[PDB]
Design a protein around this ligand. Structure first.
Ligand SMILES: OC[C@H]1O[C@@H](O)[C@H](O)[C@@H](O)[C@H]1O
Ligand SMILES: OC[C@H]1O[C@@H](O)[C@H](O)[C@@H](O)[C@H]1O
Ligand SMILES: OC[C@H]1O[C@@H](O)[C@H](O)[C@@H](O)[C@H]1O
Ligand SMILES: [Mg+2]
Ligand SMILES: [Mg+2]
Ligand SMILES: [Mg+2]
Ligand SMILES: [Mg+2]
Ligand SMILES: [Mg+2]
Ligand SMILES: [Mg+2]
Ligand SMILES: [Mg+2]
Ligand SMILES: [Mg+2]
Ligand code: NA
Ligand code: NA
Ligand code: NA
Ligand code: NA
Ligand code: NA
Ligand code: NA
Lengths: 1011, 204, 193
């Protein structure tokens, strides 16, 4: 029996699913959520042996430990211990597509544990074992006797061991198969791992026990009154003396309580459920739960005899909230939500797919700190503690069935097949049975990228029947099928339609109004944050705020799935697809995170924070209008800090309390401000600061900001005449200009500034020359590969047009000495195989003060692909500690990703001017810069720049950040213009037209001077 | 055409049909029936089974058929004859003018049923006029109603032929036997004979 | 495995369901609905023996005919042949209500047939067996080798015998269980056969 090659067999002897149990035998412990002596953890050191196929495991292992086994920690994924390689594949399955069969070489993990059981557990009641996560399928033996089997890598499998155990020492044997028929439903875009990767526990329940319970909360029209209804089911000895008492607590106060014997209402001609009871508790003015204020009550479910003996108690946290879609809007407690969401896979760079409390808390803190209020469990039910944490800290959750068959062709081949209805049904029904009482879960999802099959329609209806309290969504088959209550596309653009046949991705604004459509639209995935991305993010937020039925979306995704590898010297480095010998693989497609694998933010995180702010600001005169986007709370932990500065020089600042009701406005009249007469632009910057620490943030946390230009005094003052005049010396090969301690050398053959001296020290390692290209970003490459070029990708268009290899041809190079300066004029043409792609005309004016004014005018052929940038570059000889600029910052910012940046005076260590994206590319740009200072140099103009120890050539040629090497000196790229980075998706061109350099003619000017 | 699913003896009747663990076995009884019979023109309505209460498994299966074969209505009488799992109100033994207001699953007079607040479906009894022995009293009452009310579109008599079995006496002479006649017990005696015709097709 | 006491196992190796087929290899014969030589009936005289439970069936029956078996007409209900009694219960199940279990005493009908196929069927193509109705569940063997299992007394169960067929005489062995977890979904008011 190859049960792992039969979708008709998804378990053997497995117990029914139910919500979290702990079988407390004391009600106060259940009320306080203290640990239960009846729920033990079997996590720790286990014994493990790897085999290449199930046929290789020896019979002896059922009864005795294998000498050659190792001791390892469980939970774990065995690839993380090095027994075999993790595989990174996106769409294409990791095994041959031949359902329901899997490879005969099927890595098999033999786990075993010798553990204790106290006789007391065996004198009465039932002892079960619980495996919260085993990937992908497994057989279980206890004391050498076969117990059962399970599939579905992401939900708990439980077995009754009552009849198999003995007092004292017992031994478990778990044979885990890497591949099974369940793998056809587990093709999510992530590392393919295996093992006992979630907790293992032993739970003692009494013979007469609570076998399931469901909590519902219904409200009156204004939410001032609610009824809590709790349906409780029992298994075991049914007798009239039994009762259930459900009590509801708010802290130490008992708010309501009801007791009843078993026996539910008559439901049909054969009667009712003699083994169930429904308690209804009235609760006046309940404290409501939301992500803004996660108010919770504690429901304790006591199973007891009427005369007072507690048999056992179970319990849960309850959040009073109503989720309903009405008139096309998704409402929470009667108000329309605005989903500031993110998709989050369970990933740790050292532990793989094993989740730990610290990591989950670290993730929720950072999410909330960055203005997220919702998370989608892409693409499977999560470790159970996740839900508890979202209930308590307050995040809206989309709980998703572990069903993804992306690699099938067509994508609904299995989901439309009734033979796969049974395996799919279990992944949906068992998730609902387990997670239906958590208030954080607000929407159920039927899985991901499995097309649209009749099995989705059947399952949509199942959930709508069993749980009317939450909408059900599902994106497959075109995002607006009959199996979804919410239009939930992935990567639909704001304004641009992408009319693919069958499953078009309409502009989200257009999609809402298609003939006959009325549902709300919340993207299940948008803003693919792969590498240097998040370009256009603000476009989505402006739309969400303007259109009521556009209720947000979930960014893809939270954290890069990079894994740690160690080099010869034993230093850690971030690996991606193929780095473990895995092939085929999808390379860096596993890193799409707002944060690196160790939780350090990528620069895009601050853009998300800012666009997701909960306060909107308008300025009129010196009156600030603050509007709150909270739906339920007043701004009771917030103050507004304001500062006025003249181009970086602070002039005045203050603080004012913010007191704005949800959806309300507050007007703030600022003080008679700073009105300087000196040149420069005045600017107002406001920040919302939370004075008090919270569960998720420290005191002084900044939650929102905004900046505006106030008055501008243009400079009309004339520089003093200089007491000098540069001298020019000419040779056939060069133009040399000298002025005091300074010297400039222009090569007449190449037409560029080849060297500059200060004091008598050389300043350049490479000449100053025009640059029209960039080391391609993930979004510029998309899915292109050398074995399979994608000619539509930006990088491929640039390559084919010759941008990377065009050579400068000199058309003119002259020198003139003026009254007080020397003027160098040049013109160059860049061509490729006959074609003139760009023309650069410039003047260099060096005056008696030592300043060099550079004016550049470029022409770009209308028929060549728009270039990545229009700028100059050079390798400076100096390496300095800091970079100080007056411009946008302080973090990396690009034209379509700079809303979060503020114009000010910034000063950072050189290293901060480089963003260590795992897959190297153009990075660290800062835009809107008016003055840049590095060592003895100052550059002034209105440009964008980056500066670092790595050339664009080096970044484009190196596949991993740890292989980069600082070059001599510092490479400076200063651009008049730079293309958008895009990111609406990372597999088709996504830079919006307005961010492409298509103007044909460009002008920029800089002044390079000393100090 | 009706799926082979009947769980009448459970208590309550939907014990299995509301249980997800029984969704797989139930699903094959419905899906395989549709896969086999969907091209027959005589089949005009699919039925999810009989006397198995109303469970969420019924809702799931109703939806599956509606997706796969929109050409035919789906009906199912369990759980009160007018549940979310049926496109036709299809009671069994609801009377013409007399209501039988049983708890949870009342059998309203069929004329009254049609007009309950919010109801708009057609009503065709899945079973009526139980033809057990000397019966069919009141048959004309149904017909007069069916003709007068557009939405009362008829019904299916219960039932065609008596389920009696041939036994032979000491003489070799055959006789019609019913429950208990074979030593089977417990049994429900003559309840197996409800037809309009005797087992050999002679009319009653 | 007592696959007959597990609702998650309703079949093993059963082919997908589909509309009536006849594999006509001549379009005009398909147009006229005439007989197809690729669709043969195995109805007629089979060999049969009754057992009190599946645990009583001898392994030998897989390979050889039992001498104590009788020759009977198939299709048939075995009660009609007098092997055990047909039961008439309306609502109350004919077995103890304890899903998914059935009585240890579970009447078992062992049917067998010796047959041969055309040479060309041994050569190529797919040869399946179709049982339009078996009540309530059954295991199938061909030439002593196990083929599959089916439930649902009222729809056809089909199995591919292609790999089991041999030149000359072949032997089907069909073990039919009176009761199975399928019986919990077959509580219609009618004789239990
Ligand atoms: O990085 C590509 C992303 O593509 C989406 O289409 C998918 O649902 C995600 O799981 C991820 O694969
Ligand atoms: O003083 C610097 C400022 O100059 C203003 O003209 C400009 O709009 C601002 O964006 C900033 O560059
Ligand atoms: O003869 C009594 C009848 O009762 C009905 O309720 C039933 O659906 C029929 O199958 C038959 O049992
Ligand atoms: Mg399987
Ligand atoms: Mg008490
Ligand atoms: Mg004791
Ligand atoms: Mg995918
Ligand atoms: Mg590849
Ligand atoms: Mg009786
Ligand atoms: Mg079975
Ligand atoms: Mg009945
Ligand atoms: Na909106
Ligand atoms: Na990805
Ligand atoms: Na405040
Ligand atoms: Na690179
Ligand atoms: Na009528
Ligand atoms: Na009857």
């Amino acid at each position: 029996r190859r049960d792992w090659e039969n979708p008709g067999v998804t378990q053997l002897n497995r117990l029914a699913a139910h919500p979290p149990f702990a079988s407390w035998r004391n009600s106060e412990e259940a009320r306080t959520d203290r640990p239960s002596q009846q729920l033990r953890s079997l996590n720790g050191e286990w014994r493990f042996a790897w085999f290449p196929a199930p046929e290789a495991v020896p019979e002896s292992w059922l009864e005795c430990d294998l000498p050659e086994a190792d001791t390892v920690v469980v939970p774990s994924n065995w690839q993380m211990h090095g027994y075999d390689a993790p595989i990174y594949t996106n769409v294409t399955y990791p095994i041959t597509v031949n359902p329901p069969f899997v490879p005969t070489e099927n890595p098999t993990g033999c786990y075993s544990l010798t553990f204790n059981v106290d006789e007391s557990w065996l004198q009465e009641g039932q002892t079960r074992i619980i495996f919260d996560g085993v990937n992908s399928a497994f057989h279980l033996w206890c004391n050498g006797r076969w117990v059962g089997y399970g599939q579905d890598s992401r939900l708990p499998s439980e077995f009754d061991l009552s009849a198999f155990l003995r007092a004292g020492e017992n031994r478990l044997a778990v044979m885990v198969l890497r591949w099974s028929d369940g793998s056809y439903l587990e093709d999510q875009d992530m590392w393919r791992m295996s093992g006992i990767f979630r907790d293992v526990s032993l739970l003692h329940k009494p013979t007469t026990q609570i076998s399931d319970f469901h909590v519902a909360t219904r409200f009156n029209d204004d939410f001032s009154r609610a009824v809590l209804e709790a349906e409780v089911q029992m298994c075991g000895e049914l007798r009239d003396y039994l009762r259930v008492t459900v009590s509801l607590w708010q802290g130490e106060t008992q708010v309501a309580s009801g007791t009843a014997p078993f026996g539910g209402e008559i439901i049909d001609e054969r009667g009712g459920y003699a083994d169930r009871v429904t308690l209804r508790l009235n609760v006046e003015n309940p404290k409501l739960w939301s992500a803004e204020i996660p108010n919770l009550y504690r429901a304790v479910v006591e199973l007891h005899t009427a005369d007072g003996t507690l048999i056992e108690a179970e319990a849960c946290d309850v959040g009073f909230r109503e989720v309903r879609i009405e008139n096309g809007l998704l409402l929470l407690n009667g108000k329309p939500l605005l989903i500031r969401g993110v998709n989050r896979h369970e990933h740790h760079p050292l532990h793989g797919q094993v989740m730990d409390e610290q990591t989950m808390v670290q993730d929720i803190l950072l999410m909330k700190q960055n203005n997220f209020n919702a998370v989608r469990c892409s693409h499977y039910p999560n470790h159970p503690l996740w839900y508890t944490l979202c209930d308590r800290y307050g995040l809206y959750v989309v709980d998703e069935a572990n069903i993804e068959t992306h690699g099938m062709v067509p994508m609904n081949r299995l989901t439309d097949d009734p033979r796969w209805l049974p395996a799919m049904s279990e992944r949906v029904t068992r998730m609902v049975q387990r997670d239906r009482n958590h208030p954080s879960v607000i929407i159920w999802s039927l899985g991901n990228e499995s097309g649209h099959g009749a099995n989705h329609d059947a399952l949509y209806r199942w959930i709508k029947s069993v749980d009317p309290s939450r909408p059900v969504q599902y994106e497959g088959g075109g995002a607006d099928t009959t199996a979804t209550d919410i239009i939930c596309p992935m990567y639909a653009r704001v304004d641009e339609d992408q009319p693919f046949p069958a499953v078009p991705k309409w502009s989200i604004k257009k999609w809402l109004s298609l003939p006959g459509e009325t549902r709300p639209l919340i993207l299940c995935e948008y803003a693919h944050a792969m590498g240097n991305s998040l370009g256009g993010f603000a476009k989505y937020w402006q739309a969400f705020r303007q259109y009521p039925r556009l209720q947000g979306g979930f960014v893809w995704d939270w954290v890069d799935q990079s894994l740690i590898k160690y080099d010869e010297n034993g230093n850690p480095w971030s690996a991606y697809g193929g780095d473990f010998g895995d092939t085929p693989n999808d390379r860096q497609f596993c890193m799409n995170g707002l944060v690196f694998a160790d939780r350090t933010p990528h620069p895009a995180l601050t853009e998300a924070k800012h666009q997701q702010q909960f306060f909107q600001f308008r300025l009129s005169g010196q009156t600030i209008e603050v509007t709150s986007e909270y739906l339920f709370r007043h701004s009771d932990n917030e103050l507004l800090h304001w500062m006025v500065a003249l181009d970086g020089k602070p002039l005045a600042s203050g603080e004012v309390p913010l007191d704005v009701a949800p959806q309300g406005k507050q007007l703030i009249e600022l003080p008679e401000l700073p009105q300087p007469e000196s040149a420069g632009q005045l600017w107002l910057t406001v920040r919302v600061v939370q004075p008090n620490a919270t569960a998720w943030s420290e005191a002084g946390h900044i939650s929102a900001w905004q900046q505006w230009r106030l008055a501008e005094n243009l400079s009309v003052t004339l520089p003093a005449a200089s007491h000098a005049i540069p001298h020019l010396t000419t040779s056939e090969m060069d133009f040399c200009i000298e002025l005091g301690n300074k010297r400039w050398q222009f090569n007449r053959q190449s037409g560029f500034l080849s060297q500059m001296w200060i004091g008598d020290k050389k300043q350049l390692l490479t000449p100053l020359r025009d640059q029209f290209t960039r080391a391609p970003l993930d979004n510029d490459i998309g899915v292109s590969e050398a074995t399979r070029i994608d000619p539509n990708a930006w990088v491929e268009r640039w390559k084919a047009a010759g941008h990377y290899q065009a050579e400068a041809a000199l058309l003119q190079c002259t020198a003139d000495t003026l009254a007080d300066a020397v003027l160098i004029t040049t013109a160059h043409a860049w061509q490729h195989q006959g074609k003139t792609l760009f023309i650069s005309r410039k003047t260099y004016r060096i005056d008696g003060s030592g300043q060099m004014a550079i004016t550049v005018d470029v022409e770009v052929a209308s028929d060549t692909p728009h270039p990545a940038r229009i700028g100059l570059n050079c390798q400076l000889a100096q390496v300095a500690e800091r970079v100080n600029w007056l411009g946008l910052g302080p973090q990396e910012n690009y034209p379509d990703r700079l809303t979060a940046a503020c114009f000010d005076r910034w000063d950072l260590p050189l290293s901060d001017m480089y963003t260590p994206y795992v897959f190297p590319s153009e990075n660290g740009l800062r835009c809107g810069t008016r003055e840049l200072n590095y060592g003895p140099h100052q550059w002034r103009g209105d440009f964008q720049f980056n500066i670092s120890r790595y050339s664009q050539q080096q970044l484009m040629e190196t596949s991993h950040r740890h292989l980069l090497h600082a070059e001599e000196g510092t490479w400076l790229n200063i651009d008049g213009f730079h293309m958008g980075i895009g990111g609406d998706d990372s597999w088709s061109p996504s830079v919006s037209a307005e961010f492409q350099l298509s103007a044909g003619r460009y002008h920029y000017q800089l002044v390079w001077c000393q100090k």
